[PDB]
Amino acid sequence: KEQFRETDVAKKISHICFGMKSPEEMRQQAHIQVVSKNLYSQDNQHAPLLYGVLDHRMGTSEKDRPCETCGKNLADCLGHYGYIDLELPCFHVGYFRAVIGILQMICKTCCHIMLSQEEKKQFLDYLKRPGLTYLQKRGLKKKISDKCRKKNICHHCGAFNGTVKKCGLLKIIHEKYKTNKKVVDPIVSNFLQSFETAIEHNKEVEPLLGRAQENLNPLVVLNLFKRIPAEDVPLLLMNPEAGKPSDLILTRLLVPPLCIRPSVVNEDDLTMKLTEIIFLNDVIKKHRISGAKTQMIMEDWDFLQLQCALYINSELSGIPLNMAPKKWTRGFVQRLKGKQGRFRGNLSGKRVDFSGRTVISPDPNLRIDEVAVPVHVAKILTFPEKVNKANINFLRKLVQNGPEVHPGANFIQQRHTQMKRFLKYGNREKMAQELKYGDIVERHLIDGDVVLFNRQPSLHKLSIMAHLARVKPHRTFRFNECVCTPYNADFDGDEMNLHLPQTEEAKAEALVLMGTKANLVTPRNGEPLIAAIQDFLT
């Protein structure tokens, strides 16, 4: 009757292979096409438009309005993508030094790579050895591009190939028609005289015709990169299974889901840049029909090269004065870099719960491995104790005390349910009788819980050790003054942190490895740190 299906496919991450998309795998990923520019409808309903940004087919970023692709809330949706078409292509600002890198090696006429036939056999035998590391790859692109830039003629088509270099903000020049004081080459002597009709009406061609070279732009370097042979792609050191050279010039652009850019910041700086990119796809589209000059079309195109650059990195160097931004916005790079980025601010170190912070004060009547937790913090902090055969009589009494008397419990969770009955209400004498095995009682922090303890400038590993908690009626963290040497605490208005581990394995790694009785000596030179101090020596 019913086909077998594997129930829970838990899998482990083996490797991450970075890459890029073709501009028509963006269409296969996204759900809608974004064409409109306005954020909300003009009426008092405050509803988002149907084919612009903040469309809720791409997700949701508030509790009130659900999503439209999956019909699920903010808590459950993984977010969904859209896309934007561009009327003219633009450089991706991240790969711009890689588009120049490909152009310095391939021929600018036949799109083959400027190498001799023997040199291709040398490097493609180097690329067959197993275990090729990422350092060995980045050195090889240096060795290959240095061999291409020593040649000026192609071994396959024979056309001349000059230097390829940057000539301003997001502009690429190719000096095909270089001249010297020597005998003039025949192919450059044709270019300097074929300007005949332009000199007839325009006088200023004559001083400027010597400075005319081939100016590359995303209409042309897109068309060159489609004609690179696939045999000559790994000599550009691009893995052709993760990306192609045609993908470095964007012509279509994914927009992020709405949970990447929440609706109350009102709108995010990424949404406001996506408005200006949609708006410039109508400014260019109108000027191509209403007959603007070539001086205006290029300027509009440049604005679109700038607005897709500031959308990615809003800290460029060579922005012109008439096109510099007035205020500072976040691109994607600024919300990845720095101390307040993702990697340092939200990934390597992040805010945790089941933690406290109080002024400290001394107490020598405790042991060297105990700490005195105030009762106001011991009622808030909870450890989820599972019900089994050894602790059922204890946890029934800790449920019967309830959330207000100290050896008590704040929550209770059924066996195969994910919903926590808040134990302040109901009759706790009934919920204590119904404790089955496998239920979780979230008891308060009691005497004997392994708890971490931390003074904040943490210079060595003994700045955070684990103690055994004891509840006492005042309002400070308290410990024996022999422990004041590793933390470098001094009781002059000092705040230390606390962390209650929430797992049995997190307990046992904290007790065996991180206890005070197992960290008496410093790991630096083997000298004891937990020892006596003033008035215990005197």
């Binding site: 096409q33 406001m272 000027h287 607005q307």
Partner: protein, 103 residues
């Protein structure tokens, strides 16, 4: 509303005649002003068309059309000899072929 860039560097010196807002996206297949030029006919152009479709049926039958071998047959039966696909096998000139290619 005002943007980050200057509109006056983009254009719009009068301050009016801004482009309209696209409400619905353009269709997948925008209609064409011009049509395909019709094909060339004649007694030469049609015989090549007749010869082309004969080459598909021919080269699919020749033994150079190396089909994929069958597998995962379930049981054996006496009707295998009645279902044996017979076809003559071509053998190359191994003097022209390299030594590493003998079966």
């Amino acid at each position: 509303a005002a943007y980050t860039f200057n509109i006056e560097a983009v254009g719009f010196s009068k301050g009016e005649k801004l482009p309209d807002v696209v409400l619905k996206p353009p269709p997948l297949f925008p209609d064409t002003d011009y049509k395909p030029v019709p094909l060339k006919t004649g007694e030469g152009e049609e015989y090549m068309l007749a010869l082309k479709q004969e080459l598909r049926e021919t080269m699919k039958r020749m033994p150079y059309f190396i089909e994929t071998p069958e597998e995962r047959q379930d049981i054996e039966r006496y009707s295998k000899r009645y279902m044996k696909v017979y076809k003559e096998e071509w053998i190359p000139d191994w003097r022209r072929l390299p030594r590493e290619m003998m079966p």
